[PDB]
Design an enzyme around this catalytic site. Sequence first.
Site, short mmCIF file in Angstrom:
data_model
loop_
_atom_site.label_atom_id
_atom_site.label_comp_id
_atom_site.label_asym_id
_atom_site.label_seq_id
_atom_site.Cartn_x
_atom_site.Cartn_y
_atom_site.Cartn_z
CE1 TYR A 9 42.49 46.34 33.74
CE2 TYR A 9 41.33 44.91 35.26
CZ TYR A 9 41.91 46.12 34.96
OH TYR A 9 41.91 47.13 35.91
CG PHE A 17 37.71 41.97 41.37
CD1 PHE A 17 37.78 40.63 41.03
CD2 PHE A 17 38.83 42.76 41.22
CE1 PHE A 17 38.95 40.10 40.54
CE2 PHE A 17 40.01 42.23 40.72
CZ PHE A 17 40.07 40.89 40.38
CG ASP A 18 39.46 46.34 37.85
OD1 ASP A 18 38.74 47.17 37.25
OD2 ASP A 18 40.69 46.46 37.96
CB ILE A 75 49.44 41.07 40.72
CG1 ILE A 75 48.55 40.76 39.51
CG2 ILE A 75 48.70 41.96 41.70
CD1 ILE A 75 47.25 40.10 39.87
CE1 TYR A 127 46.62 43.87 44.75
CE2 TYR A 127 45.25 42.31 43.57
CZ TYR A 127 45.84 43.55 43.66
OH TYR A 127 45.67 44.46 42.65
CG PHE A 135 42.69 38.93 35.80
CD1 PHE A 135 42.17 40.20 36.00
CD2 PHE A 135 43.42 38.34 36.81
CE1 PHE A 135 42.37 40.85 37.20
CE2 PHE A 135 43.62 38.99 38.00
CZ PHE A 135 43.10 40.25 38.20
#
Lengths: 204, 97, 436, 107, 273
Positions: free
Chosen positions: D26, D36-37, D56, D82, D99
Amino acid sequence: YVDASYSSKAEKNFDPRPVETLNVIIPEKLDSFINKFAEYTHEKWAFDKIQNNWSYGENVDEELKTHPMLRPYKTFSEKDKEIYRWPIKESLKAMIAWEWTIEKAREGEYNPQPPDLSGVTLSRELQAMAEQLAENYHNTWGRKKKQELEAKGGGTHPLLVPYDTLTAKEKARDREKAQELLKFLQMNGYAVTRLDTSSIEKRF
Amino acid sequence: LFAGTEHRAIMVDSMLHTVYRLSRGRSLTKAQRDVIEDCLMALCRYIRPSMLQHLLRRLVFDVPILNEFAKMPLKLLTNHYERCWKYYCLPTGWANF
Amino acid sequence: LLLQTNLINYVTSIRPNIFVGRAEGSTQYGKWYFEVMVDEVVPFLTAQATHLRVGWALTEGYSPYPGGGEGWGGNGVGDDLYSYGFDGLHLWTGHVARPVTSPGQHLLAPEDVVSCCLDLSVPSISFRINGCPVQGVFEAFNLDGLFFPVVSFSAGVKVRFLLGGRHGEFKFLPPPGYAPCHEAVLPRERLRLEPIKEYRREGPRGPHLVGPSRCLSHTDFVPCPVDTVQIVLPPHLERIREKLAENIHELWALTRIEQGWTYGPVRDDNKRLHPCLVNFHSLPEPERNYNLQMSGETLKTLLALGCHVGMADEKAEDNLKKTKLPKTYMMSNGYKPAPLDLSHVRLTPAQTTLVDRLAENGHNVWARDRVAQGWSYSAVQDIPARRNPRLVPYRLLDEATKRSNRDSLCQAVRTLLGYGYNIEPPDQEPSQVENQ
Amino acid sequence: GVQVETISPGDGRTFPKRGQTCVVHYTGMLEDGKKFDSSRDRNKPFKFMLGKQEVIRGWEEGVAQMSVGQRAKLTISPDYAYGATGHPGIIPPHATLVFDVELLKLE
Amino acid sequence: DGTVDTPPCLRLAHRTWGSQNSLVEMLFLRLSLPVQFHQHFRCTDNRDDPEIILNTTTYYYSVRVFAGQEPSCVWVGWVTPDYHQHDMNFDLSKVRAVTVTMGDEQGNVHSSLKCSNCYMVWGGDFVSPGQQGRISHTDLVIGCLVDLATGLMTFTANGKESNTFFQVEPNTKLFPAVFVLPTHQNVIQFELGKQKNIMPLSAAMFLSERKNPAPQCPPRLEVQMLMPVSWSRMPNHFLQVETRRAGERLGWAVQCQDPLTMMALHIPEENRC
Ligand SMILES: Nc1ncnc2c1ncn2[C@@H]1O[C@H](COP(=O)(O)OP(=O)(O)OP(=O)(O)O)[C@@H](O)[C@H]1O
Ligand SMILES: COc1ccc2c(c1)CN(Cc1ccc(C(=O)O)cc1)CCS2
């Protein structure tokens, strides 16, 4: 180098001699143009007021920073009309005194609807006469200016120079005035007549 | 100190005309006349060629007479054009002038 | 506030040397078509997804440099307002990805064929993937430049350009009215794949630094003949104007005799039959008058270009030798055409430059006349479609045809000199185009 | 609040069910375009089991709709991620997460 | 600095106007900080109302064209961070534009977005065709209004609403920019003021000033000019691209296999790396 003004007076402090025309009689056979264009130049000043964004007024005043006596022809007194023609009278005298005959090829005839401009081009032979007339504007201007100045004997006006010597920026005053008269003669068809050198032959 | 007086070209041009008009002055001794001529020569050596245009215009009317007063202007013109020949001849003109 | 860091892949663009555009009076066709077939794509060769976009870009403005740029770098097609790309799922323009709907949406994969259509008349850019239409079009974009096919990619791709003809057979039939991009190759250049505004390239002994590249403009395809509105020919030039058409026709007929043309009622190049291939007088007057309009301009352009020409010699016109075709090299009619013999005539080097300018103007006059009739340039000649390989400005014409027009104008000048008329080469006026 | 937009098709037959480990690669970015990731940077696929609330809740439905080998784009509303609390120092509050998820295999 | 009756301003002056060797050419100016539209758009005396001013999303700034500067040589508006058009003969026809149109399987356009990098108005559209006196007594004060919650942009000539308007997509960054060809010593003046019930630009450029209606000109906000050429570092390695003609039917093949990666430094407010 090729000089744009490839012509000279071939004459001779500096004393600008004017052109003597009061002695000779002024032909009045073309008076249909002499009187008409004499008041037409001042008529163009009316169009200059609407471009100044300040209109014409009747009362004499120094606050309008324009001509204070400019009035519509319905209430325009001819006292000023009969004195503004003098510069035009000698202007026609000047251009006819230099052996330049003028012939009326054509036969005809509060806002100056026909606009007299100066941004258009013209032939070299006819424009040369206008520049020569513009020279006569300057020397006559220089003559009367130096008459007041000569009473001192010291110093001179910065523009008391020959017409060919002064640059174009100080020439546009007499240049445009002479051209504007020629432009009026252009669209009506006034033929005034008294060379053909290529650019290569004009090089230094 | 007259090298960069473009911002005061009107005063500088008036100065050049006055000193030149002083040179063409009657009732001047020979010693006095050369001092005026030397000042005029010195000024034209450092003043930019563009600011000498009006002085040259006056010289055009006077030098061709070739009278006794024409000796100094001839030398002045000789030094001016020899020094500033690139300003008039080269199409790109003199450097930074 | 704080500066951001991330690892990005390098993206490079590859284009064919095919440039099309639209301009008033231009000789270029308006609708173009090409295909790109994907053979091998590694979806993730690195941590970042593989880049692959197909579309059109504008010559004046699309200059993707390697490394940094807009957004997070890796700028390709559609990362500015000079390019319009398509990656299988989105339409890219101005560095903004807009999702688009197609039957079976997926990112560009092997065995995918992307069809790009450019219609400069609207203007509009449309795409098709594997034959199905892509429900999204670019339109109402700028036209101040030339458009070229372009593909942007990262490492791990393998695509093939399909340009039609012998440069890649199309997998799908182009939409009606669109022309294959291979027809847009200029006569002076060969089709090839090149980078875009590269400042560096590999060389034999090491990398080569490359300066700016000269690029054409959409105005370069607009013929600009000199003005001939001032239709005032001297009377001696007016009478000899028609006689000039007689001589050039014989010279044109003579050159056809070298090509094998003979006399014939039908006028065909392949059949090599020409009614004019008998004699200038035996040539029909209406057929002679076909180039009389052109012949009138030829003398007029001499005045237009600034050349000083007059009837310097009249006795020279009265007496002059006539070259005739050899009896062995005869046409079907068998007569000997008699063009003016001008072997004794010599031309100054300045006059030779005038012939070059006359040839350039004559081609441009013919070019703009054909454009008004609807003709357009094409590498492959198509008479029913009004496509001509020579429908290009003279400067862009190949040297082989350029010399052919130059020789014809030389004979016309020789004919004037044969009559003894004075020809004054104008004092050439230099100019700086400032293309860039 | 999960929207699944396909990028590359999968097999279309096998789907992850409850209690089965999912191996995915991902790359997560905020909906404005800021990453961010990403599991690609660490060069190690991410493994999780559906139904255990390890990730999540947006990933719970999003991956369940995908097939093995399929690469899809999941847009998760703040409620399904979140949300108001957010991830301190990583994800701002009330942020929509996007994502790019590829389902490598199931184990 | 902002006085009692004037807001803080950034005034541009021509140092060498009128003198010899003066440089006169098209000047492309913009402010150093952008305004960013909201992520999501909303569905569908002379004293500010406290409740309206604290809930509004409309921001204002104006440009004063001083008397002597021709309005016909002034363009006022906004530029996106991807504007790189250094045209010495600039006009509104040179502005990059493109329309992206989406539809269903059979035509039926359901979305037609318009994209550009320059949203400006011409100063020549706000001058009456008076006989002359085009150098007016009154300076032209072109105002710009942006609503970050709707993406709608409007302009005012001298307090009169103009007909031109623009619509932009969410998350768009716009820099206040003026394109001017100088014709006077005093050229332009960025006026970072406010209108009635409208927040100033400082309220939109800075997070800490979102609810501050007092106009501010912090030091970070400065006038930037478009520089045609800049130094750039050549990469140490370049992608190896192999181009060849695969055949008559296969066409021309492009191939690139060896990966290359660089570490990019991204400047957030300029949206460039
Ligand atoms: N009057 C003219 N007609 C046609 N071509 C001309 C003419 N004058 C010059 N040319 C030149 O001839 C070339 C094109 O000629 P074109 O293709 O028409 O020849 P063609 O096919 O032999 O003639 P045609 O179409 O009459 O059968 C160009 O280089 C053009 O500049
Ligand atoms: C420069 O001028 C040219 C240059 C090239 C050509 C022609 C005329 C001729 N045109 C048609 C034509 C052919 C023959 C005649 C004739 O013999 O009368 C008249 C017109 C096109 C064919 S190539």
